[PDB]
Design a protein around this motif. Structure first.
Motif, PDB file in Angstrom:
ATOM      1  N   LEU B 101      45.774  55.600  53.592  1.00 11.44           N
ATOM      2  CA  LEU B 101      44.990  54.846  52.610  1.00 11.44           C
ATOM      3  C   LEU B 101      43.565  54.897  53.100  1.00 11.44           C
ATOM      4  CD1 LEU B 101      44.733  52.975  50.190  1.00 11.44           C
ATOM      5  CD2 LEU B 101      45.314  51.041  51.666  1.00 11.44           C
TER       6      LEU B 101
ATOM      7  N   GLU C  83      50.755  38.447  47.427  1.00  9.89           N
ATOM      8  CA  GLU C  83      50.323  38.167  46.054  1.00  9.89           C
ATOM      9  C   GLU C  83      49.193  39.089  45.595  1.00  9.89           C
ATOM     10  OE1 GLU C  83      50.765  33.518  44.902  1.00  9.89           O
ATOM     11  OE2 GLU C  83      49.151  34.649  43.913  1.00  9.89           O
ATOM     12  N   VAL C  84      49.421  39.845  44.504  1.00 11.50           N
ATOM     13  CA  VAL C  84      48.439  40.787  43.960  1.00 11.50           C
ATOM     14  C   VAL C  84      48.028  40.268  42.576  1.00 11.50           C
ATOM     15  CG1 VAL C  84      47.987  43.206  43.386  1.00 11.50           C
ATOM     16  CG2 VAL C  84      49.628  42.637  45.250  1.00 11.50           C
ATOM     17  N   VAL C  85      46.782  39.817  42.417  1.00  8.94           N
ATOM     18  CA  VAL C  85      46.295  39.238  41.145  1.00  8.94           C
ATOM     19  C   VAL C  85      45.214  40.136  40.593  1.00  8.94           C
ATOM     20  CG1 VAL C  85      45.293  37.175  40.018  1.00  8.94           C
ATOM     21  CG2 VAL C  85      46.845  36.908  41.998  1.00  8.94           C
ATOM     22  N   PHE C  86      45.363  40.577  39.341  1.00  8.20           N
ATOM     23  CA  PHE C  86      44.426  41.528  38.728  1.00  8.20           C
ATOM     24  C   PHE C  86      44.351  41.403  37.207  1.00  8.20           C
ATOM     25  CE2 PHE C  86      47.446  44.706  36.857  1.00  8.20           C
ATOM     26  CZ  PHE C  86      48.632  44.312  37.446  1.00  8.20           C
ATOM     27  N   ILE C  98      51.264  49.494  42.118  1.00 11.64           N
ATOM     28  CA  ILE C  98      50.864  48.511  43.137  1.00 11.64           C
ATOM     29  C   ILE C  98      51.610  48.914  44.376  1.00 11.64           C
ATOM     30  CG2 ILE C  98      50.799  46.046  43.824  1.00 11.64           C
ATOM     31  CD1 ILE C  98      49.005  46.835  41.194  1.00 11.64           C
ATOM     32  N   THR C 109      47.527  45.938  50.427  1.00 10.34           N
ATOM     33  CA  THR C 109      47.917  46.262  49.075  1.00 10.34           C
ATOM     34  C   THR C 109      46.855  47.087  48.442  1.00 10.34           C
ATOM     35  OG1 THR C 109      48.842  45.514  46.988  1.00 10.34           O
ATOM     36  CG2 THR C 109      47.233  44.025  47.980  1.00 10.34           C
ATOM     37  N   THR C 110      47.268  48.077  47.676  1.00  8.40           N
ATOM     38  CA  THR C 110      46.322  48.947  46.974  1.00  8.40           C
ATOM     39  C   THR C 110      46.843  49.179  45.588  1.00  8.40           C
ATOM     40  OG1 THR C 110      44.721  50.785  47.159  1.00  8.40           O
ATOM     41  CG2 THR C 110      46.896  51.380  47.600  1.00  8.40           C
ATOM     42  N   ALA C 111      45.941  49.433  44.679  1.00  2.37           N
ATOM     43  CA  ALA C 111      46.308  49.757  43.321  1.00  2.37           C
ATOM     44  C   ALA C 111      45.942  51.191  43.055  1.00  2.37           C
ATOM     45  CB  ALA C 111      45.562  48.864  42.353  1.00  2.37           C
TER      46      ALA C 111
ATOM     47  N   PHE D  78      39.398  45.857  41.452  1.00  2.00           N
ATOM     48  CA  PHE D  78      40.693  45.709  40.851  1.00  2.00           C
ATOM     49  C   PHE D  78      41.185  44.242  40.895  1.00  2.00           C
ATOM     50  CE2 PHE D  78      45.351  45.722  41.033  1.00  2.00           C
ATOM     51  CZ  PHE D  78      45.628  46.407  39.862  1.00  2.00           C
ATOM     52  N   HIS D  79      41.171  43.629  42.084  1.00  2.00           N
ATOM     53  CA  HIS D  79      41.773  42.298  42.288  1.00  2.00           C
ATOM     54  C   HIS D  79      40.880  41.158  41.844  1.00  2.00           C
ATOM     55  CE1 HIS D  79      43.619  44.977  45.261  1.00  2.00           C
ATOM     56  NE2 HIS D  79      44.758  44.343  44.986  1.00  2.00           N
ATOM     57  N   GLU D  80      41.496  40.049  41.403  1.00  2.00           N
ATOM     58  CA  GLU D  80      40.716  38.860  41.064  1.00  2.00           C
ATOM     59  C   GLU D  80      40.272  38.193  42.377  1.00  2.00           C
ATOM     60  OE1 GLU D  80      39.928  37.358  37.807  1.00  2.00           O
ATOM     61  OE2 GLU D  80      40.257  39.517  37.537  1.00  2.00           O
ATOM     62  N   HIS D  81      41.150  38.227  43.389  1.00  8.76           N
ATOM     63  CA  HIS D  81      40.908  37.613  44.679  1.00  8.76           C
ATOM     64  C   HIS D  81      41.948  38.126  45.648  1.00  8.76           C
ATOM     65  CE1 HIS D  81      43.294  34.571  42.285  1.00  8.76           C
ATOM     66  NE2 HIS D  81      44.147  34.797  43.290  1.00  8.76           N
ATOM     67  N   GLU D  83      44.755  36.645  48.126  1.00  7.73           N
ATOM     68  CA  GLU D  83      45.504  35.390  48.295  1.00  7.73           C
ATOM     69  C   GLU D  83      46.437  35.428  49.495  1.00  7.73           C
ATOM     70  OE1 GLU D  83      46.480  33.185  44.119  1.00  7.73           O
ATOM     71  OE2 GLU D  83      47.915  32.884  45.763  1.00  7.73           O
ATOM     72  N   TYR D 105      39.642  48.611  45.398  1.00 13.06           N
ATOM     73  CA  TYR D 105      41.012  48.682  44.871  1.00 13.06           C
ATOM     74  C   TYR D 105      42.076  48.327  45.898  1.00 13.06           C
ATOM     75  CZ  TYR D 105      39.578  50.354  40.264  1.00 13.06           C
ATOM     76  OH  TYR D 105      39.044  50.481  39.005  1.00 13.06           O
ATOM     77  N   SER D 106      41.668  47.698  47.016  1.00 12.92           N
ATOM     78  CA  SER D 106      42.634  47.399  48.057  1.00 12.92           C
ATOM     79  C   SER D 106      42.162  46.286  48.956  1.00 12.92           C
ATOM     80  CB  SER D 106      42.865  48.662  48.904  1.00 12.92           C
ATOM     81  OG  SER D 106      43.771  48.478  49.979  1.00 12.92           O
ATOM     82  N   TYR D 107      43.103  45.552  49.549  1.00  9.56           N
ATOM     83  CA  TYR D 107      42.763  44.623  50.618  1.00  9.56           C
ATOM     84  C   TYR D 107      43.907  44.521  51.620  1.00  9.56           C
ATOM     85  CZ  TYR D 107      45.405  40.707  48.569  1.00  9.56           C
ATOM     86  OH  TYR D 107      46.365  39.883  48.041  1.00  9.56           O
TER      87      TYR D 107
END
Ligand SMILES: [Cl-]
Ligand SMILES: [Cl-]
Lengths: 115, 115, 115, 115
Positions: B101, C83-86, C98, C109-111, D78-81, D83, D105-107
């Motif tokens: 990644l 938790e993935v929020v988008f 996801i 996490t990656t999209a 991509f993400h809202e936040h 969490e 697009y990732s965290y």
């Protein structure tokens, strides 16, 4: 302190302690020359590898001995080591912090570069 | 297919396409010998690097040319490449998938080893 | 298939199998409403959560039950879940994958969004 | 200092500065109650969220406002936040450091838990 290394253990949620770290600098003949080495502290940090005077421009490799770390914890890991290769001080001196996050079958590395 | 590579781009949220990947095998003189290479597809995958017959036990290095990838997108990267070094061990039937990644100043790599 | 989930285990170096995944969509009263759910397969994949018709623009949450996964393997985890929020946005044809890489005290996490 | 947050930017290779962080604690009625909040410093750190006296056992959620961070840099993420949900102090008081590594697009998130 122009080059620092911080290592975290993602299994235990703790600093990765007593991890061997070897730094090499690429020579004019394209071979890797030993530059500095040390072991992470109780806080998973390795300070004092080099000095502003010694840490000239070049291509550097930071080899983190993750295999010996996992073997000392009784876990047979996938990687021999975590290898971070980068050009340093190309646009003048910078301070580099190399983070490594370790798991038996995975690692992540990030650099924080400050002027 | 005993060895596959999959590369993802964390800035664009997409497969990392046309990324050069070089595989080396450690020789008896402790040097790295070219073993296989290729470029990732439109799905960020690289298949058919080797065969069951050729992929014997030994120490392998998978070098992912991340610097050229970021430079082709006009993004200033940190690493010269992402380097995955591991020992291939015959513990029953095995397939290795090396996942990477990528971000400009960070990368993560994981191995998925299945029967 | 507009929404797929793939989960990997960084301790075992394998797909994360039989992991519970819950998808929620934000309702007008700002609460999270159940939208879709399932369990990852032997390949760590979860397909067929939704359809193009049902998966309209809106805010979605993908909750991966990582705590139950680690507890079933006898490993002490940190997180209750990943938790993935988008926001899903219609900018031409799109498929969301996801990806989640799991460790006991860490996750990534990656999209991957493709046309 | 029982709960600290450190946020890094994987695009720029720098601390993620002025990032909003909201901490919630799960109440007996299973709702999320506001617990603490703040913004990361120039070093990407957030200290003084809580105290040993206030930080009792419970389920906590650390919400990192990554969307506003990327939007302020002209990047549509991509993400809202990001969490982070975890049970704290279940076996007595602990000190928690929550690391978050951000890309558009990732965290990734990691916890360092010390006694
Ligand atoms: Cl053997
Ligand atoms: Cl729109």
């Amino acid at each position: 302190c122009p080059l620092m290394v911080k290592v975290l253990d993602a299994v235990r949620g703790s600093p990765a302690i007593n991890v061997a770290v070897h730094v090499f600098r690429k020579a004019a003949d394209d071979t890797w020359e030993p530059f500095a080495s040390g072991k992470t502290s109780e806080s998973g940090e390795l300070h004092g590898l080099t000095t502003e005077e010694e840490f000239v421009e070049g291509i550097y490799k930071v080899e983190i001995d993750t295999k010996s770390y996992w073997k000392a914890l009784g876990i047979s890991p996938f990687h021999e080591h975590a290898e971070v290769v980068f050009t340093a001080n190309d646009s003048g001196p910078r301070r580099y912090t190399i983070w490594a996050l370790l798991s038996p079958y995975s690692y992540s590395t990030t650099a924080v570069v400050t002027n």
